[PDB]
Nucleic acid binder design. Structure first.
Lengths: 125, 127, 99, 79, 155, 60
RNA sequence: CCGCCGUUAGUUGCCAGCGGUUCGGCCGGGCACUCUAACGGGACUGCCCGCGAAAGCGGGAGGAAGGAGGGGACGACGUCUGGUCAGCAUGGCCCUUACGGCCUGGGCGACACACGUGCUACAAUGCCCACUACAAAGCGAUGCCACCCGGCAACGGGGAGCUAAUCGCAAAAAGGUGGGCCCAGUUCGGAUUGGGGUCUGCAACCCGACCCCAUGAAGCCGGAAUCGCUAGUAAUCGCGGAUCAGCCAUGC
């Protein structure tokens, strides 16, 4: 039961089931699960074409997902990487655009904290 | 006509009216066994009427404000104690050895400047 | 019909102002509903014992504002006269109204 | 953010709209960087301050209505 | 302490049957201070035991608890720069208490999903003896009767 | 600077958001309990020295 | 401060006791009960018994209160040339159209690591949506802001009462009562990520909180080691105030 991007949820209530697809969180999911019929509770199990197919019609005709959605991301990332803005600056530098912590944390954005050497410490004792 | 006691525990309070009749009890509106469909201490608070096995002769009417569900419960117990130990202090003879009047203690103590829960202290370094 | 509220910092004297009124008022007229005490609202303050970076070591201080309330019945000329004239709050605050 | 509107400043306004009275010299000399970039600046040599000195930044399209003083580094030294 | 022998302080004289044993169990089961919740889990487990097995709750309770209740354990002593794994008989209260703990964490070990299931199951098979709690019982009894060379080498 | 700073705010400039409280019994902005118009050390020196009504060396 | 009782006192509370009702303390009435907040009494090994030469200890009761009842402020003589001249004063040395003063910008938030205190977590004693529950304390006039409305919301337009025990902040939350998930990098955890919105403020780039919807990392419960805590203490859960345009408050 491929919908968009070969994505088939298999046995799981239709809501969380279609939620398992990129471009669709709880909102866009349940939203679809009204605007194309389909009972939220009723599982993906005993599903039926018409309403499944039309759910898929609600996916694409309304909004986009996957490839273009991230292509959009990366291309506007290129918008940050066409002038050289702080956003793009530290997008290159491997750093977040939030100007918060560059001293300690932010290891979500540049691999594990790879030890310098310690450099030996001041009068700490 | 009126057989009254005062309840009060862990910062809460219960106006404990007790008249007589069928000894059935309901408090602050809603039926007693729905008001407190949580803690099992419920029926336990009704121990004094079960201390003489006269659970159903004296009609209680209680007004408990404050504390919590359980705190309410506490004050209720306190009062049901005090009320039968008025209109028959013959019941006092066999209720203090049972401990049906020692009020309470308990206070989330004044938070100590320097520590958390007036006791709970921050992790000590040394280093 | 009289609404006299007395706001005070010295509860000792502030209360002495509460019953006094009531005597001469129960005297220079008819009933004067007792001084009735009202929630001493307290403004909590606090700060550290010293100047240098000493996170612990602190002293609390707070404002004790005691509220008083006298109600008298249907007033009289003596009552109103003297008991709007004579006083010596020397600080304490006296605020009345017609409710 | 201006919820209804977009923040900008009139130094730039009076300036741009007066070189637009002809289309003259290839320099402007602005001190403001808090300002939002506008497309009527055309987008030549908007010479902006940084913290140490004025440093000219180019401007065309994709910097549409996002802030000026963002294409002026400031945070010198990298890692 | 040092200038004292401390205090014991009575446990909850049970709101169900009246047994302090039950409230001690309830407490050990209880987590984060919500005595009621976990107590309920226990009671569910109980009514399950007595919709399944014949003998009444407090009976299963006693046969399980008893089928742990370890007497001789090991503790420690001083030896210049070494240690003595001192086998020693345990005070009845300490025995019974830790035993209860072992019932609880025996419910922990399990691949069981719901709580009442774990607690019930344990109380059943431990009334029996088929459990890791009794395993660790007789284990600390190895410990005791296998450091028994330190018999009168107690502290 | 110091002296000039108290004067800076003492005369309200342009924007409402450029005022900052001032301990007129010590002279600073940090931790000036605006209720009293006093800093914290100025606060304690006043209350302690008995020159402050309504208070109380609280013991609650 | 907190636990028991009393006397003053009754715009908080109430059929507790009566009348009626828009049956909702809502309309009169009343001080009983809570409460409020004042002035005292009450606990001393005082009583009873066994031990010790006594100091004390064991057991029991009278009582709300046992043997210091729980807490708080309370901190000597002294050390340590501790900390502080960037709160203040301050002896001296020192620049004096510059080390003085204003302004606009920029940093105090930077990043190849390291560290203390911390929030959250890694999950079924759980996550999620629905119904009902009991809090205490502290706030609020050019502020508290219930109400309809526009907006899914952020919040915005008209709008009540309020110098407060009478008006609003405010929904306590966990509890309980139904239905979903079915053991999974999961409806877990949201770290981070993009296209858009709200609010304050001259101004939100550096560098604001908050809203949306799409993104959904590490995390499978932490080795050496090491911290807290002895009773309503720990653990868990929510709530306010300080200063503040706003808010980096997971802090106190």
């Amino acid at each position: 039961a491929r919908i968009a991007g070969v994505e088939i949820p298999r046995n799981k209530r239709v809501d969380v089931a279609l939620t398992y697809i990129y471009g669709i969180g709880k909102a866009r999911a349940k939203e679809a699960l009204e605007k194309t019929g389909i009972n939220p509770a009723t599982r993906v199990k005993d599903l039926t074409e018409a309403e499944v197919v039309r759910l898929r019609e609600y996916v694409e005709n309304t909004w986009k997902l996957e490839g273009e959605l991230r292509a959009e991301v990366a291309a506007n990332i290129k918008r940050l990487m066409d002038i050289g803005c702080y956003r793009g600056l530290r997008h290159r530098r491997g750093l977040p655009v939030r100007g918060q912590r560059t001293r300690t944390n932010a290891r979500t954005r540049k691999g594990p904290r790879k030890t310098v050497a310690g450099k030996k410490k001041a009068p700490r004792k | 006509e009126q057989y009254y006691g005062t309840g009060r525990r862990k910062e809460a309070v219960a106006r404990v009216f007790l008249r007589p009749g069928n000894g059935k009890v309901t408090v602050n509106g809603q039926d007693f066994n729905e008001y407190f469909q949580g803690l099992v201490r419920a029926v336990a608070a009704l121990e004094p009427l079960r201390a003489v096995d006269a659970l159903g002769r004296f009609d209680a009417y209680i007004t408990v404000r404050g504390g919590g569900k359980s705190g309410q419960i506490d004050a209720i117990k306190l009062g049901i104690a005090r009320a039968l130990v008025q209109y028959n202090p013959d019941y006092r003879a066999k209720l203090k050895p049972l401990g049906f009047l020692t009020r309470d203690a308990r206070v989330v103590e004044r938070k100590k400047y320097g520590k958390h829960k007036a006791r709970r202290a921050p992790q000590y370094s040394k280093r | 019909k009289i609404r006299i509220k007395l706001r005070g910092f010295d509860h000792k004297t502030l209360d002495a102002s509460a019953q006094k009124i009531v005597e001469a008022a129960r005297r220079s007229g008819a009933q004067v509903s007792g001084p009735i005490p009202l929630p001493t609202r307290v403004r909590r303050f606090t700060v550290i014992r010293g100047p240098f970076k000493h996170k612990d070591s602190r002293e609390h201080f707070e404002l004790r504002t005691h509220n008083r309330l006298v109600d008298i019945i249907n007033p009289n000329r003596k009552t109103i006269e003297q008991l709007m004239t004579l006083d010596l709050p020397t600080g304490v605050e006296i605020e009345i109204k017609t409710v | 953010s201006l919820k209804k509107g977009v923040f900008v400043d009139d130094h730039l306004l009076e300036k741009v709209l007066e070189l637009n009275a002809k289309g003259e010299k290839r320099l402007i000399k602005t001190w403001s960087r808090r300002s939002t970039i506008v497309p009527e600046m055309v987008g030549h040599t908007i010479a902006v301050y940084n913290g140490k000195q004025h440093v000219p930044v180019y401007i065309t399209e994709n910097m549409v209505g996002h802030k000026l003083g963002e294409f002026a580094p400031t945070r010198t030294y990298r890692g | 302490a040092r200038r004292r022998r401390a205090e014991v302080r009575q446990l909850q004289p049970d709101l169900v049957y009246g047994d302090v044993l039950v409230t001690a169990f309830i407490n050990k089961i209880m987590r984060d201070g919500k005595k009621n919740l976990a107590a309920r889990i226990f009671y569910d487990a109980c009514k399950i035991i007595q919709e399944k097995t014949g003998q009444e709750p407090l009976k299963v309770f006693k046969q399980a608890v008893e089928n742990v209740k370890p007497r001789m354990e090991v503790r420690s002593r001083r030896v210049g720069g070494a240690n003595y794994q001192v086998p020693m008989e345990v005070s009845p209260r300490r025995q019974q208490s830790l035993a209860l703990r072992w019932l609880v964490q025996a419910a922990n070990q399990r691949p069981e999903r719901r709580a009442a299931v774990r607690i019930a199951h344990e109380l059943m098979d431990a009334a029996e003896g088929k459990g890791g709690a009794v395993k660790k019982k007789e284990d600390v009894e190895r410990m005791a009767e296998a450091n028994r060379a330190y018999a009168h080498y107690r502290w | 600077a110091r002296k000039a700073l108290i004067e800076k705010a003492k005369r309200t400039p342009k924007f409402k958001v450029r005022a900052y409280t001032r301990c007129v019994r010590c002279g600073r902005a940090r931790s000036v309990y605006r209720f009293f118009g006093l800093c914290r050390i100025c606060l304690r020196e006043l209350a302690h020295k008995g020159q402050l009504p309504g208070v109380r060396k609280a013991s609650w």
